[PDB]
Design a protein around this motif. Structure first.
Motif, PDB file in Angstrom:
ATOM      1  N   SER A   1       1.056  -1.207  -0.091  1.00 15.77           N
ATOM      2  CA  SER A   1      -0.074  -0.210   0.059  1.00 15.77           C
ATOM      3  C   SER A   1       0.560   1.412   0.068  1.00 15.77           C
ATOM      4  O   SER A   1       1.548   1.192   0.742  1.00 15.77           O
ATOM      5  CB  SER A   1      -1.176   0.120   1.340  1.00 15.77           C
ATOM      6  OG  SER A   1      -0.182   0.682   2.456  1.00 15.77           O
TER       7      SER A   1
ATOM      8  N   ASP B   1      -0.263   4.109   2.105  1.00 20.26           N
ATOM      9  CA  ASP B   1      -1.032   4.843   2.346  1.00 20.26           C
ATOM     10  C   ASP B   1      -0.135   5.608   3.465  1.00 20.26           C
ATOM     11  O   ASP B   1      -0.232   6.777   4.095  1.00 20.26           O
ATOM     12  CB  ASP B   1      -2.020   3.884   2.950  1.00 20.26           C
ATOM     13  CG  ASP B   1      -2.644   3.286   2.332  1.00 20.26           C
ATOM     14  OD1 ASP B   1      -2.842   3.583   1.183  1.00 20.26           O
ATOM     15  OD2 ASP B   1      -3.013   1.991   2.844  1.00 20.26           O
TER      16      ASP B   1
ATOM     17  N   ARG C   1       0.223   9.062   3.236  1.00 20.96           N
ATOM     18  CA  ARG C   1      -1.010  10.182   2.760  1.00 20.96           C
ATOM     19  C   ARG C   1      -1.326  10.355   4.854  1.00 20.96           C
ATOM     20  O   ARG C   1      -2.161  11.326   5.279  1.00 20.96           O
ATOM     21  CB  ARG C   1      -1.696  10.221   2.477  1.00 20.96           C
ATOM     22  CG  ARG C   1      -2.663   8.648   2.869  1.00 20.96           C
ATOM     23  CD  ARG C   1      -3.379   7.894   1.982  1.00 20.96           C
ATOM     24  NE  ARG C   1      -2.354   7.793   0.474  1.00 20.96           N
ATOM     25  CZ  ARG C   1      -1.816   8.070  -0.542  1.00 20.96           C
ATOM     26  NH1 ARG C   1      -3.006   9.055  -0.936  1.00 20.96           N
ATOM     27  NH2 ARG C   1      -0.986   7.173  -1.221  1.00 20.96           N
TER      28      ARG C   1
ATOM     29  N   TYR D   1     -10.148   4.083  -0.222  1.00 22.12           N
ATOM     30  CA  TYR D   1      -9.400   5.438  -0.049  1.00 22.12           C
ATOM     31  C   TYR D   1      -8.833   5.662   1.211  1.00 22.12           C
ATOM     32  O   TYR D   1      -9.587   6.624   1.815  1.00 22.12           O
ATOM     33  CB  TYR D   1      -9.612   6.193  -0.485  1.00 22.12           C
ATOM     34  CG  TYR D   1      -9.117   7.778  -1.316  1.00 22.12           C
ATOM     35  CD1 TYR D   1      -9.399   8.762  -0.836  1.00 22.12           C
ATOM     36  CD2 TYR D   1      -8.708   7.801  -2.743  1.00 22.12           C
ATOM     37  CE1 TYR D   1      -8.229   9.547  -1.204  1.00 22.12           C
ATOM     38  CE2 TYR D   1      -8.167   8.812  -2.593  1.00 22.12           C
ATOM     39  CZ  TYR D   1      -7.672   9.670  -1.703  1.00 22.12           C
ATOM     40  OH  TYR D   1      -7.388  10.931  -2.047  1.00 22.12           O
ATOM     41  N   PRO D   2      -7.983   5.776   1.750  1.00 21.09           N
ATOM     42  CA  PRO D   2      -7.826   5.171   3.237  1.00 21.09           C
ATOM     43  C   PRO D   2      -7.703   6.528   3.993  1.00 21.09           C
ATOM     44  O   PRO D   2      -8.160   6.640   5.629  1.00 21.09           O
ATOM     45  CB  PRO D   2      -6.122   4.173   3.460  1.00 21.09           C
ATOM     46  CG  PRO D   2      -5.572   4.359   2.091  1.00 21.09           C
ATOM     47  CD  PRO D   2      -6.617   4.383   1.333  1.00 21.09           C
ATOM     48  N   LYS D   3      -7.143   8.190   3.142  1.00 18.06           N
ATOM     49  CA  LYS D   3      -6.944   9.160   3.920  1.00 18.06           C
ATOM     50  C   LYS D   3      -7.598  10.200   2.829  1.00 18.06           C
ATOM     51  O   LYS D   3      -7.347   9.946   1.925  1.00 18.06           O
ATOM     52  CB  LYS D   3      -6.214   9.448   4.774  1.00 18.06           C
ATOM     53  CG  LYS D   3      -5.515   8.218   6.149  1.00 18.06           C
ATOM     54  CD  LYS D   3      -5.113   7.365   6.104  1.00 18.06           C
ATOM     55  CE  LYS D   3      -5.175   7.100   7.486  1.00 18.06           C
ATOM     56  NZ  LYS D   3      -5.079   5.710   7.842  1.00 18.06           N
TER      57      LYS D   3
ATOM     58  N   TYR E   1      -7.817   2.010  11.177  1.00 18.54           N
ATOM     59  CA  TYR E   1      -6.203   3.040  10.859  1.00 18.54           C
ATOM     60  C   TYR E   1      -5.350   3.419  11.931  1.00 18.54           C
ATOM     61  O   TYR E   1      -4.129   3.891  11.761  1.00 18.54           O
ATOM     62  CB  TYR E   1      -6.283   3.552   9.914  1.00 18.54           C
ATOM     63  CG  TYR E   1      -6.709   3.443   8.410  1.00 18.54           C
ATOM     64  CD1 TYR E   1      -7.096   1.952   8.139  1.00 18.54           C
ATOM     65  CD2 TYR E   1      -7.656   3.987   7.568  1.00 18.54           C
ATOM     66  CE1 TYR E   1      -7.898   1.614   7.010  1.00 18.54           C
ATOM     67  CE2 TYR E   1      -8.429   3.902   6.841  1.00 18.54           C
ATOM     68  CZ  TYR E   1      -7.625   2.592   6.422  1.00 18.54           C
ATOM     69  OH  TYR E   1      -8.747   1.945   4.768  1.00 18.54           O
TER      70      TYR E   1
ATOM     71  N   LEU F   1      -3.691  -3.817   6.326  1.00 18.59           N
ATOM     72  CA  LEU F   1      -4.639  -3.744   5.845  1.00 18.59           C
ATOM     73  C   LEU F   1      -4.666  -3.826   4.301  1.00 18.59           C
ATOM     74  O   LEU F   1      -5.562  -4.492   3.337  1.00 18.59           O
ATOM     75  CB  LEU F   1      -3.075  -2.562   4.657  1.00 18.59           C
ATOM     76  CG  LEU F   1      -1.879  -3.377   3.816  1.00 18.59           C
ATOM     77  CD1 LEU F   1      -2.382  -3.300   2.093  1.00 18.59           C
ATOM     78  CD2 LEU F   1      -0.544  -2.387   4.133  1.00 18.59           C
TER      79      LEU F   1
ATOM     80  N   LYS G   1      -9.664  -3.619   2.910  1.00 25.16           N
ATOM     81  CA  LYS G   1      -9.634  -3.347   1.455  1.00 25.16           C
ATOM     82  C   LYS G   1     -10.384  -4.581   0.497  1.00 25.16           C
ATOM     83  O   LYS G   1     -10.732  -4.644  -0.160  1.00 25.16           O
ATOM     84  CB  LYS G   1      -8.080  -3.159   0.463  1.00 25.16           C
ATOM     85  CG  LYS G   1      -7.644  -4.256   0.644  1.00 25.16           C
ATOM     86  CD  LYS G   1      -7.326  -4.441  -0.547  1.00 25.16           C
ATOM     87  CE  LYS G   1      -6.175  -5.226  -1.017  1.00 25.16           C
ATOM     88  NZ  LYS G   1      -6.266  -6.046  -2.101  1.00 25.16           N
TER      89      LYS G   1
END
Lengths: 184, 97, 673, 905
Positions: free
Chosen positions: C21, C23, C26, C606-608, D156, D181, D185
């Motif tokens: 990822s 991620d 961000r 769209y994690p953040k 998260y 993660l 998803k």
């Protein structure tokens, strides 16, 4: 076992036990100074330590208690057979040269009007209160009178008057100092 | 423990028998006489429990609450039985206390 | 030390940007505030490990250092290879990062001050109930009102009064007469006549042949028999949606009228043996045989004897066995029998009879009543008696039908365990009952020589025992979890005195005599909201089920109301309604989460979105939780090597996976095939 | 079929899934013998670890295949996601174990009440020490429950956490990051098919629209639906709780940023639970106007709600309630330092649920509930009704109530069995007829041990078990009683006691400790063994005779496979390869389905190794052996026994004779929480290990020749197992186990080399004939106020130095508080005042009689110093005190004061 210092301590104790016992049983041609050296560190110094460590371990009572029982019970058998083999060695040496638990009950002892059951408890509370310098509680004076405990149970009446002024109190040596550091 | 004797050892059974008889008493005046005797006895005998007294898990405040409840019950029974019409009872207890 | 092993082959991998990822950057973008840039937060995040160096082997800290330099190089950040500059950088970083609790403290009093407004309070509990009833009134019309005569059956679902083929022979020699109809208030298009016609038809001429010894079908009669049969079938539908309010008058007076009538209905049985009685008195008529030291206690065994004899006088085991036979007969009545058949249920009693009346889940109960105890039986079940009639010295009654469920059958089957233990517990709790049982002895106990106060509290305990042991309706569930959610009142200010009533209350009351419960708990709550300073004594209040003045300790009330709470089965509706609720709670929760976060049902996660900055709905403080985790791992794990070895040894990853028992027992995997 | 791959789930066996993945790691696509017997020789064989398995399956599922691994229902999880959740929770559970103020690493039940009470008492102690000479002080607690912990929490926050842990290295931190993660998803939940069809039909014919749960689907065109931030409840009860405690200490460190006030907030965190406090000192008024509240619980509730809302924790106002005296952890709300007992849950579960598999095991579970409700401060008169209640549920649910069919007393009376009513065993439909004490202290093995002890006492014609101990332990006495039994049986002059004894020995012959005997099976696995692929592999590779002798021959080739637990490869998959219901059976019970019903119950009644093993397990039990003598000689009252009467005898005689028979406690009235102290399940596992070897040996010798009573002198394994099974094999292996001490070292090479028969089924169970333990019963909280004799003498031996400081102390102090007392009175009170259920004077006397006898004899110095060295070292201080009451001899006193108180190589 894992608990650091005590783990190392009772590892060290039984490796000392096993090494000293194999060295005592290593060779024996001479006379009984070998067993005289073996006796005090095979029977006295370490067995009662494992008996103590069985009954004073608290955080291992649900994880390691059946382990510790199997250790110390075999230690008890080891102590008994040590005594037997040592007697055999002595017998060679100088020739060549159940119901005990069931003795309980009948426990209502009264002296005069005062029960001799709450006197011990009240007086150990008295010593505790004087040790931390605190006032005695009223509830410790509750179990003094026999009339509360006379409604149920067999009564043993021992005729001794409450005499507190004669010679035999003088041989106790128990904190003669009167400490009242809040009192005018 | 102090080898001392307490006065009037034979009051509790007499008071219990008197209250049991008062449960079955139909007399108006005898109830007032016995309650006045109880009030005089409780006034003549003071209570010497200190503020530092702790009995088990009961503090001095709990025992004082029991004493206040008992005095409230006795005074309520006295006021229910004795009907003297509003002779300013809020000024005598404050001066006595 | 301790020969630390490398329990992976990922020695060359890096947590930053070599993983799948994208991620982390961000997260770094969302976590930069004023005076903190990308490089400094990256340095702090992946170099705060240096607080734990003294308790690790050299190869592990070499791996951490090479991962640190690879993470700095790969993320286009200037790395620090030296140690003095690294230490200087990290001590100014701990200085700037410890200068962050002030901003969060100001933000949380800011949030508390904006939470202080926009809220309203209620003066008292009664006004809370009126205001909740007002909200439910403008929520939906056509409810509340003062009409009590339109309601359904009040005393749950079963009836059993005190008094094999000989019983139904007695019934059929008694039913050769006519019928009357008596009600509460005047009805229209009276369907009690159709039910009387139904019982007349199904019992006069067609009870001579039986299939499988208890049921029978019907195939060949005349057309008028099928006409009145289908008319009785067309009666079988009743629906209602009203509510009886919390401030209603004279329904309570009705409730003690029916309570006294039911108690004088109780003491009329003439049986002395039975199924439940034998096991209970074999444990209880000689209760010293379950003990060892009998001679030490002599004021407790005969009290259990007295309770057993008093329950034998009230036929509690007899009623429990009657409901047991009732329940098991309805369990077997749910079977492959058709829609033109029905079944009889006869218990161990001599004058109680049932009609199954189709498969469905309905039935009809029948009764045989003498002449001495007559009009108060018309008082008892008056909301659900359709008709009654006279034959000789006999009154015979016809009762309103209702519906069943299999969990309701379970709650009825539990009754010989329900009623006696709760009856014994509340009889233990009532201290005036204790002194009355203490005064009387075993051969001088009777029902016709009690004190009127003892009489009334025994009426209350009989009613509460029957009602708790025969829970069948949803309103019982509602009053029970309302009692549990309002058991938080009797101590200091817990900020849920009225807001639960204002927001989270569900007004649903079906039939009468639960008003006794709700005003008992209303009296209890108004007693508890009376002023409390530090502490007090217990006796100044009243039980919920059994009134029971001069309470011993609040433990007693906690226990008995939680008995009244804990004996409720979970789903008395269906398995697929609570099943669907358990799926739809995360469905609606995730839908409103998606709506608040701006996602749709087609995109990815769209994690953040950089929205994750101290918003109320779904956000974090960003730089705060990372510091909290950092100093938690600092303050929790000390001497990392030895507890690392403990992790590798106790949970034994160096052993194969089947060595662990928890991953080999019957958990069921649900693999996809 | 909507250009997708719809697939329903199917729940398989977890062991089978591990077996399949261990196979498919080793390129083992097709079942074959020679691909696994080739390698894996002993402890030097091939091995696999957990984490390489984890990364192998992780690399397998890194390939895109529709994310079938990330498809879970509620309260259910797939195999790989169980692996990653296991990895996270079981690598972090020791980190949770390292926190002293956290309670997800509880020891079952007792740690909860203990830690909540210690939190309460330390908090109140801190309040009391801050009450002295301070300006202002106020304190409050909080028992909080969160609204929807499973679905409100942002996952998260964990992603920001795993990279901060120094316990890992670069690469396994990335392992946990990548699995987390991947968990967020690809998550989807499969709706049940029946409710899917119901809702689809309802939309099709009635609605033509849907509620919210239908808008995720594109008009109900997909079976499954995704949830993103909802990790389901019960999956992560460890990590979430600890990071919730991280938020707690974030609150703490946030509150030391306040200037004019000081705060010390400690916490207990359970999953879905809080129990915390706060202490403020100084100017409270400006503080409460700063946070806009009038009470400290109000400020605490508002601050905690705002803080939880700041980090995706939804707090529920209807259930979280905070006051000044209560803490509700799950239950047992403790007020003012005193715990409420709350037996309502126990007595409620006494009559609300059962395990619902069989009569006996439901009776066992409800009996455990009886022990719990009796152990939690039971009220007065409800014990016999509770006995009757659990009995009538055990009768009414499965095995019918007396007076009708399926009875126990009626069957015994119609058979004319000589047994009386109150000794029928509990497997035989016998009711819970045990008394309060043996059920209370033991649990399962109370009534059966009581009836077995009484009938062994009856047939053995002794009076007490202390007679039975040294009568049985002498050899050949049991043999002469059994031979006079055989003489009485051939003569035909048997009596009712012999008939009872032969019935109980043949009952225990067809038994475990307590099995069910009547065991009706379920739907037989023969139609569901095809669901397990291990049965397929067992049946994939005249002919029946050769195939079973071949497979038994390959067990005989390596006998250590079937008998040791799997230690390495080639010994695990071979070992596994070679080894609303109440509503159903209220109709299935009264039926002739398995060709018999309640006639099988009586046909079992219709018809010395068992004798000596049963009397041995009677006498080798430890806690029962000390349980009986304190019953049969027990005082009624006083000496801190009966101070009150309001349910007061229901706590003191339940455990003061028992618990004070052990040390560590002095209290009278306290609700206790015990360990698993009674371990009768350590005699049964060697017997079962012998049962497998007897089965294997019997199959081998019966399939090499017929009608075997002795072998024809084949190999030494057959010869030594002929010595094994000549008599009763269990009896001979346990009997020879008392003087053989092999314990071979688990190398799988010297094990077959040393001795191929006896240490195989005697030392490969990690257990043998040994002695159990008795604990101190672990008093949890105070309420509202021949082998026996050796270990007991060792108790006095280690307690001797303590009672030398105790008895001398109390003797001196009673002499202090009575000066008119006499030596006879000292003897009398020292005969009556007891410690650890041992009278002091007789306990000293049994030890000192032998040392006086050894001293008064003609032994020299070396024969006396080495005899009683521990005794003389202990009595150095109080030898004069022993001489004072005429106890110690003057020769012994003289000995103590003289010798103690001072070519070739």
């Amino acid at each position: 076992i894992v608990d650091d210092d005590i783990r190392e301590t009772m590892d060290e104790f039984l490796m000392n036990i096993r090494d000293t016992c194999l060295e005592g049983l290593e060779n024996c041609k001479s006379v009984e100074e070998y067993d005289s050296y073996l006796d005090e560190n095979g029977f006295n110094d370490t067995v009662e330590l494992f008996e103590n460590l069985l009954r004073t371990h608290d955080n291992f009572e649900n994880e390691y208690s059946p382990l510790f029982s199997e250790i110390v019970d075999k230690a008890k058998q080891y102590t008994r057979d040590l005594e037997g083999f040592k007697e055999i060695l002595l017998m060679l040496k100088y020739s060549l040269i159940m119901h005990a638990v069931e003795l309980m009950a009948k426990k209502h002892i009264e002296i005069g009007e005062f029960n001799l059951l709450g006197m011990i408890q009240l007086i150990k509370a008295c010593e505790t209160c004087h040790n931390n310098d605190s006032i005695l509680n009223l509830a410790s004076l509750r179990n003094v009178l026999s009339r509360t405990y006379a409604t149920f149970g067999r009564r043993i009446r021992l005729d001794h008057d409450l005499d507190l002024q004669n010679n035999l109190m003088e041989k106790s040596y128990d904190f003669k100092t009167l400490v009242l550091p809040e009192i005018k | 423990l102090t080898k001392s004797r307490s006065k009037e050892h034979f009051l509790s059974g007499r008071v219990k028998k008197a209250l049991i008889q008062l449960r079955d008493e139909q007399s108006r005046t005898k109830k007032l006489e016995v309650y006045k005797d109880i009030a005089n006895f409780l006034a003549r005998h003071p209570l010497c429990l200190s503020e530092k007294t702790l009995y088990g898990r009961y503090t001095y405040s709990d025992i004082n609450d029991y004493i206040m409840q008992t005095r409230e019950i006795i005074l309520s029974k006295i006021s229910e039985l004795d009907e003297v019409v509003e002779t300013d009872e809020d000024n005598f207890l404050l001066s006595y206390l | 030390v301790f020969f630390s092993h490398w329990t992976s082959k990922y020695k060359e991998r890096n947590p930053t940007e070599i993983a799948y990822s994208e991620d982390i950057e961000r997260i770094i973008d969302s976590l930069v505030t004023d005076e903190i840039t990308k490089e400094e937060i990256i340095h702090f995040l992946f170099g705060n490990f240096c607080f734990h160096i003294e308790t690790m082997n050299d190869q592990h800290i070499a791996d951490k250092f090479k991962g640190y330099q690879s993470s700095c190089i790969n993320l286009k950040i200037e790395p620090k290879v030296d140690l003095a500059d690294l230490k200087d950088h990290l001590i100014q970083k701990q200085q700037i990062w410890e200068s962050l609790y002030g901003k969060h403290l100001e933000k949380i009093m800011l949030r508390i001050r904006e939470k202080k407004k926009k809220e309203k309070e209620i003066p008292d509990i009664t006004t809370a109930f009126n205001q909740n009833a007002a909200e439910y009134e403008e929520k939906y019309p056509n409810c509340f009102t003062n009409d009590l005569s339109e309601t359904k059956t009040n005393f749950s679902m079963t009836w059993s009064p005190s008094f094999n083929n000989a019983i139904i022979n007695k019934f059929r020699e008694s039913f050769k007469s006519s019928s009357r109809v008596i009600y509460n208030s005047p009805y229209s298009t009276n369907k009690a006549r159709d039910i009387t016609n139904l019982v007349r038809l199904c019992l006069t001429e067609l009870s001579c042949l039986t299939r499988n010894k208890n049921e029978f079908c019907m195939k060949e009669t005349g057309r008028e028999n099928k006409t009145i049969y289908f008319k009785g079938l067309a009666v079988m539908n009743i629906h209602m949606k009203k509510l009886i309010r919390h401030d209603n008058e004279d329904s309570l007076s009705w409730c003690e009228r029916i309570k006294d009538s039911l108690f004088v209905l109780h003491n009329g049985d003439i049986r002395e043996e039975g199924k439940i009685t034998s096991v209970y008195n074999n444990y209880a008529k000689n209760p010293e045989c379950l003990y060892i030291q009998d001679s030490v206690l002599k004021t407790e065994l005969e009290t259990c004897k007295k309770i057993n004899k008093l329950c034998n006088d009230l036929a509690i085991y007899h009623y429990s066995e009657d409901m047991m036979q009732f329940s098991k007969g309805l369990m077997v009545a749910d079977r492959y029998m058709t829609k033109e058949s029905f079944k009889i249920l006869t218990t161990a009693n001599t004058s109680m009879m049932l009609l199954a009346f189709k498969s469905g889940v309905p039935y009809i109960a029948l009764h045989i009543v003498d002449e001495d105890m007559s009009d108060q039986f018309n008082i008892c079940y008056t909301k659900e008696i359709y008709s009654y009639f006279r034959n000789g010295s006999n009154y015979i009654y016809i009762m309103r039908p209702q519906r069943l469920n299999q969990v309701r059958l379970l709650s009825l089957f539990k009754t010989p365990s329900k009623v006696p233990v709760c009856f014994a517990q509340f009889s233990k709790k009532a201290n005036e009952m204790e002194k009355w049982l203490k005064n009387k002895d075993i051969e001088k106990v009777n029902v016709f020589s009690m004190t009127m106060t003892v009489k009334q509290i025994l009426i209350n305990i009989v009613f509460s025992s029957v009602m708790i042991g025969t829970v069948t309706k949803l309103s019982r569930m509602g009053i029970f979890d309302f009692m549990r959610y309002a058991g938080f009142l009797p101590l200091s200010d817990y900020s849920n005195i009225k807001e639960y009533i204002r927001d989270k209350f569900d007004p649903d009351i079906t039939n009468v005599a639960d008003i006794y419960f709700v005003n008992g708990i209303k009296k209890l709550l108004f007693r508890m909201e009376d002023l409390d300073i530090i502490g007090g004594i217990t006796d100044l209040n009243i039980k919920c089920p059994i009134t029971g003045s001069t309470l011993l300790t609040l433990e007693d009330l906690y226990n008995n109301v939680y008995l009244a709470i804990y004996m409720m089965p979970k789903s008395l509706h269906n398995h697929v309604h609570n099943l669907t609720s358990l799926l739809n709670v995360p469905a609606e929760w995730e839908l409103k989460f998606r709506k608040e976060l701006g996602f749709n049902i087609f995109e990815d996660i769209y994690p953040k979105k950089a929205m994750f900055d101290d918003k109320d709905l779904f956000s974090i403080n960003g730089a705060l939780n990372v510091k909290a985790l950092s100093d938690y791992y600092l303050g929790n794990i000390e001497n990392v090597g030895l507890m690392r070895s403990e992790i590798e040894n106790k949970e034994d990853f160096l052993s194969p996976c089947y060595k662990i028992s928890t991953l080999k027992s019957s958990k069921k995997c649900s693999q996809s095939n | 079929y909507y250009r997708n791959n719809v697939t329903v789930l199917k729940s398989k066996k977890v062991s089978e899934e591990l077996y399949d993945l261990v196979k498919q790691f080793h390129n083992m696509m097709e079942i074959d013998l020679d691909s696994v017997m080739n390698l894996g020789k002993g402890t030097e064989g091939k091995k696999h670890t957990f984490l390489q398995m984890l990364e192998f399956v992780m690399s397998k599922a890194k390939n895109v295949t529709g994310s079938v691994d990330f498809l879970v229902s509620v309260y259910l999880m797939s195999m790989k996601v169980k692996m990653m959740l296991y990895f996270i929770e079981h690598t972090f559970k020791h980190v949770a174990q390292s926190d002293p103020s956290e309670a997800i690493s509880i020891s079952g039940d007792n740690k909860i009440r203990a830690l909540s009470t210690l939190s309460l008492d330390t908090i109140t102690s801190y309040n009391d020490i801050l009450n002295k000479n301070s300006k202002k002080s106020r304190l409050a607690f909080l028992s909080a429950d969160q609204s929807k912990w499973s679905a409100s929490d942002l996952t998260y926050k964990y992603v920001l956490a795993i990279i901060l842990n120094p316990i890992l290295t670069t690469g396994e931190a990335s392992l946990m990051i990548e699995c987390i993660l991947m968990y967020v998803k690809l998550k989807k939940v499969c709706i049940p098919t029946d409710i899917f069809l119901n809702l689809r039909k309802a939309q099709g014919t009635f609605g033509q629209n849907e509620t919210a749960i239908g808008l995720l689907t594109k008009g109900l065109t997909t079976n499954t639906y995704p949830v993103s931030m909802n990790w389901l409840q019960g999956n992560l009860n460890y990590l979430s709780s600890v990071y919730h405690s991280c938020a707690m200490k974030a609150y703490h460190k946030t509150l030391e940023c306040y200037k004019d006030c000081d705060f010390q907030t400690r916490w207990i965190v359970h999953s879905d639970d809080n129990a915390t406090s706060l202490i403020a000192s100084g100017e409270v008024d400006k503080m409460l106007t700063d946070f806009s509240s009038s009470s400290l619980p109000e400020m605490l509730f508002r601050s905690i709600e705002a803080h939880f809302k700041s980090f995706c924790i939804t707090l529920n106002p209807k259930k979280s309630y905070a006051s000044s005296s209560e803490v509700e952890f799950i239950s047992e709300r403790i007020v003012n330092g005193a715990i409420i007992p709350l037996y309502c849950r126990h007595l409620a579960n006494c009559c609300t649920e059962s395990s619902h598999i069989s009569y006996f095991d439901d009776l066992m579970s409800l009996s455990i509930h009886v022990t719990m409700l009796l152990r939690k401060g039971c009220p007065n008169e409800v014990i016999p009704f509770a006995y009757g209640a659990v009995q009538v549920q055990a009768l009414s649910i499965y095995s019918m109530l007396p007076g009708e069919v399926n009875d126990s007393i009626r069957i015994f009376k119609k058979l004319g069995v000589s047994l009386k009513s109150n000794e029928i065993p509990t497997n035989m439909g016998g009711w819970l007829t045990s008394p309060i004490e043996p059920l209370s202290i033991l649990g399962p093995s109370s009534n059966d041990q009581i009836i077995y002890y009484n009938v062994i006492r009856d047939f053995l014609n002794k009076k007490s078990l202390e007679e039975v101990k040294d009568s049985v332990s002498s050899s050949s006495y049991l043999q002469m009683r059994f031979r006079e039994l055989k003489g009485k049986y051939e003569k035909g002059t048997l009596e009712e006691k012999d008939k009872k004894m032969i019935f109980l020995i043949n009952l225990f012959e067809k038994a475990t400790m307590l099995t069910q005997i009547i065991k009706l099976p379920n739907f037989i696995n023969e139609n569901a063994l095809n669901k397990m692929s291990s049965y397929k592999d067992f049946s994939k590779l005249i002919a029946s005779s050769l195939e079973m002798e071949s497979v038994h021959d390959i067990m005989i080739k390596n006998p250590e496979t079937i008998l040791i637990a799997p230690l390495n490869d080639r010994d695990f998959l071979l070992s596994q390869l070679f080894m609303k219901l109440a509503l159903d059976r209220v109709l299935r019970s009264k039926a002739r389905t398995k060709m018999t019903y309640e006639e099988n119950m009586e046909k079992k009644i219709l018809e010395y190794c068992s004798f000596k093993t049963c009397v041995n397990l009677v006498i080798k039990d430890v806690n029962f052996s000390m349980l009986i003598p304190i019953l049969d000689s027990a005082y009624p009252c006083e000496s801190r026994k009966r101070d009150n009467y309001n349910f007061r005898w229901f706590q003191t005689e339940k455990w003061i004779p028992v618990v004070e028979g052990s040390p560590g406690l002095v209290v009278m009235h306290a609700v206790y929480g015990s360990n698993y102290i009674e371990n009768l399940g350590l005699k049964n596992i060697p017997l079962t290990d012998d049962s497998i070897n007897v089965l294997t040996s019997t199959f081998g010798t019966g399939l090499i020749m017929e009608d075997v009573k002795s072998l024809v002198k084949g190999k030494d394994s057959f010869e030594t197992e002929a010595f094994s099974n000549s008599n009763e094999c269990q009896r001979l292996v346990k009997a020879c186990n008392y003087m053989i001490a092999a314990q071979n070292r688990l190398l799988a090479i010297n094990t077959c080399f040393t001795r191929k028969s006896f240490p195989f089924y005697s030392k490969f169970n990690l257990g043998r004939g040994f002695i159990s333990n008795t604990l101190a019963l672990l008093s949890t909280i105070y309420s509202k106020e021949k082998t026996i004799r050796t270990v007991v003498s060792a108790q006095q031996d280690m307690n001797l130095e303590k009672i030398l400081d105790t008895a001398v102390y109390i003797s001196d102090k009673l002499q202090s508080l009575f000066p008119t007392i006499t030596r006879e009175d000292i003897v009398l009170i020292l005969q009556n005042v007891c410690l650890d259920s041992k009278p002091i004077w007789q306990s000293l006397e049994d030890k000192m009689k032998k040392i006086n006898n050894s001293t008064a004899s003609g032994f020299t110095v070396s024969n006396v110093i080495l005899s009683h060295n521990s005794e003389l070292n202990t009595i150095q201080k109080q030898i004069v005190w022993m001489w004072n009451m005429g106890l110690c001899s003057h020769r012994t006193l003289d000995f103590v004061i003289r010798y103690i108180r001072r070519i070739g190589i």
